[PDB]
Amino acid sequence: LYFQGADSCIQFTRHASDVLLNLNRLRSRDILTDVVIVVSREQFRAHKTVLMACSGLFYSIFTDQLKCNLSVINLDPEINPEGFCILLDFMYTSRLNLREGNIMAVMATAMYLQMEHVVDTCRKFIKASE
């Protein structure tokens, strides 16, 4: 459906989430992926534009005239790959699968990737356990 937005335009309620859904479908089928992210010898294929849109670290890398052409990016080998996988799924879905058993790895990975809204959110959930 659609509605009249604050600017008097027609606004499509599901458009942004539908675009993201379609980008995730492309990722799952490996269509137009243009980078591999390597974490602890695990490989993750993705779209650079989605990475940049969600992460300060990826934004900096892919706006750098030298690094923007790399098709393989290695992360710190101490990064937990499940932490990365969770954040990558978040990027492509808006859904963050936080659990007691993964929250610290997810928070550390989000800090490394410069995903500040995710970092803040992990803080509140940790602080509520205390």
Ligand X SMILES: Nc1ncc(Cl)c(Nc2ccccc2)n1
Q: Which chain residues interact with ligand X by CB under 6 A?
A: 22, 25-26
Q: How far apart are CA 63 and CA 56, in angstroms?
A: 11
Are 106 and 83 contacting, i.e. CB atoms less than 8 angstroms apart? yes
Nearer Cβ to ligand X (1/6): 1
Query: Minimum Å distance from CB 81 to ligand X?
Result: 26
For the CA atoms of 113, 59, 50, 9, the dihedral, rounded to the nearest 10 degrees, stands at: 120
Neighbours of 103 (CB within 10 A): 17
Token pair of 103 as six digits? 């929250």
Query: Minimum Å distance from CB 12 to ligand X?
Result: 13
Nearer Cβ to ligand X (49/102): 49
Query: Minimum Å distance from CB 74 to ligand X?
Result: 28
Nearer Cβ to ligand X (30/100): 30
